[PDB]
Design a protein around this ligand. Structure first.
Ligand SMILES: N[C@](CC1c2ccccc2Oc2ccccc21)(C(=O)O)[C@H]1C[C@@H]1C(=O)O
Ligand SMILES: N[C@](CC1c2ccccc2Oc2ccccc21)(C(=O)O)[C@H]1C[C@@H]1C(=O)O
Ligand SMILES: [Mg+2]
Ligand SMILES: [Mg+2]
Lengths: 386, 386
């Protein structure tokens, strides 16, 4: 069982509803993220301005946070290509996946069948290879832009000789060393899972560019520290979609029978079975806080809606003319999007199909972090407020 | 419609029954080649020595000589992985394709789903990349081995300064120049489709290594000539499977209703419709000559049968133990085959999964070509009979 919402044109969806063991339900990353695609489709399908006589449908599938399970799920998006000899739908594009390895596997199949993809959460730098991942685009910037911004910070501050402190931790240090111009890296000490103040005491002695996420940063805290007193942090520009909060909060078992995994979500966050009541409120009988990449789910869906809106204006008086265009033509319309997102900020794709890096810069200057500048597209607007 | 032959274990088949426009029926390359897989499966399923209580089934699909049509056909081999919510069979391996571009596209999909492939006709050197084409193996040697043998001929003869005379023509000249050791290439003149004796008159003037196939060689004919008086040719060791000739010759419309494309084959080669008789003999009312790669179809099928035979001996008293092994385990058993083929010659795979090059060497020494040696695995046994 999966979510199948009828429409004139269908958008494939890949969400990690359950974690890898399949397994148990993932509250924020699965349910909020998928419901955001449903909320986005509810918005678009209430909107007379975008896709007027075209209802956007959805085939939303769980990935179980495992790339192999997702690859067998992706086949659902290509059923219409299988010959019948033993209710058709055309999946024009796919919104997902969440978790870069899953997206890579999924890109490997979609590429062959010329079906565009837009990830809302996959951040891996491998995915930036527009030849290998021909049909992949994303609304999140690759983690490489974070490191590029860190080079710019260091260089503008004139650090020169800086020390750098899993799959993510290394990739940051790799991207940072690659940008030369230039500067030299001294001691590149590592910190894995499971020294005690020894690494902190050994601060090169000849700035520290920390690539440790996310509770690892708190463990470390005379010398300057730059991590992704007077420490500098690079952060993404994050936002809440209030419209979606009213939607998810109002979700009960009675009004949300379309989400096949909602009753399963109901048991989890409420610590009850099916003893439970079945008459509680999300923001009342639990601690609700909207998942950070929900903004990127909506943005991913809208990118595709706008791309499909432009195509319909150019090809229809879903007319048959539109029905025989194919993904390579849809990719053009996808890559040419430039519109204001759910957070307010514009949605665009670079040459490789990546979202440009938009980061705020803070320094530990009643103390706390003071906004010391920002990083946009390929520029560093640093201030002398340090 | 496609050929579906029931069995305990199923082998996928890809054959160019029709040419690219789909299109009209291809007599030798489609019908003989597919019927050879049916004949092979008839042999194995009559054999008490190979797969005793295991019937080898087949899902044989037409590729229409177009890689995109074949990619949508390949999905048939992965139907069992598609979830049911809107008669199962497990395709353990695929015999095909014919035409390297088709095999490349097919390898790109099968790789993902860990399903082994064995081509009987795809000769392209790209396919030799055991990392990129992880699950691909072939019973035909890459065209690169022909060029390697040509370097060995030249070098043993001490030519030193030799001149070299589509996708194939260039690939040979590319593979020949790459092997250095070493020798130098003088004038590398080209001959496309649609000079007249001018290129023949200009024979460097400072041996000619001809990479022109197949009617182009006759057009060219003081100096020495080596092409793939006293000219040297490199040829593959070819053979007829007499067992198959009796089979195809005896094929009528009444006894061959399992071949969905046979009645279509009946119209073509006999210049009649459905005025026709429907009571004629293949070798009698037409010119019959067995397609050259039929030997490689049987060999491809047997490779897989032997691989499945060994697996059954190691895992069964098709037991469930065998059913959950998967292609990566079947690939091991595929790559370890060493058995005598339908032509008599042994069937083995190198490190990259390629069949070793086995070529005979002839020289224009009542004149004609005289057997002057051979080339095997990675060795050149040349004779002083020139
Ligand atoms: N953004 C993620 C995360 C990025 C990452 C990249 C590769 C491997 C693991 C990995 O996990 C971490 C851990 C700490 C910091 C950044 C990452 C992605 O996979 O792209 C995506 C799964 C997360 C989601 O947002 O659902
Ligand atoms: N063996 C082929 C042929 C090889 C080739 C390789 C690449 C492109 C075209 C091409 O056509 C020629 C022409 C002349 C000499 C060698 C080739 C393959 O594609 O591998 C395969 C289709 C033929 C079959 O045997 O069904
Ligand atoms: Mg609307
Ligand atoms: Mg038998």
């Amino acid at each position: 069982h999966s979510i199948r919402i009828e429409g004139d044109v269908t958008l494939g969806g890949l969400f990690p509803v359950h974690a890898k063991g399949c397994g148990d339900i993932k509250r924020e990353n699965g349910i909020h993220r998928l419901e955001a695609m449903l909320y986005a489709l509810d918005q678009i399908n209430s909107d007379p301005n975008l896709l007027p006589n075209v209802t956007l449908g959805a085939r939303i599938l769980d990935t179980c946070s495992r790339d192999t399970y997702a690859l067998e799920q992706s086949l659902t998006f290509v059923q219409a290509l299988i010959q019948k000899d033993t209710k058709p739908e055309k999946v024009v594009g796919v919104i997902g996946a969440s978790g870069s390895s899953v997206s890579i596997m999924v890109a490997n199949i979609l590429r062959l069948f010329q079906i565009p993809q837009i990830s809302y959460a996959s951040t891996a730098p491998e995915l930036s290879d527009d030849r290998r991942y021909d049909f992949f685009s994303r609304v999140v910037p690759p983690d490489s832009f974070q490191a590029q911004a860190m080079v710019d910070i260091v260089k503008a501050l004139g650090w020169n000789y800086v020390s750098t402190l899993g799959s993510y931790g290394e990739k940051g240090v790799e991207s940072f060393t690659q940008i030369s111009g230039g500067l030299s890296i001294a001691q590149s000490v590592r910190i894995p899972q499971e020294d005690f103040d020894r690494i902190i005491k050994q601060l090169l002695d000849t700035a520290v560019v920390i690539f440790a996420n996310d509770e690892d940063i708190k463990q470390i805290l005379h010398f300057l520290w730059v991590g992704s007193e007077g420490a500098i942090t690079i952060q993404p520009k994050r936002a809440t979609v209030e419209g979606f909060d009213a939607y998810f909060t109002s979700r009960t078992l009675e009004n949300n029978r379309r989400n096949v995994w909602f009753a399963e979500y109901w048991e989890e966050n409420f610590n009850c079975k099916l003893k439970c009541t079945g008459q509680e409120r999300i923001g009342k009988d639990s601690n609700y806080e909207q998942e950070g990449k929900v903004q990127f789910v909506i943005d991913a869906v809208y990118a595709m809606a706008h791309a499909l809106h432009h195509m319909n204006k150019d090809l229809c008086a879903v007319c048959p003319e539109m029905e025989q265009a194919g993904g390579k033509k849809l990719l053009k319309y996808i890559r040419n999007v430039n519109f204001n997102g759910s957070a307010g900020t514009p949605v665009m794709f670079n040459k490789n199909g990546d979202a440009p890096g938009r980061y705020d810069i803070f320094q530990y200057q009643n103390p706390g972090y003071r906004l010391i500048g920002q990083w946009t597209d390929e520029l560093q607007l640093n201030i002398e407020d340090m």
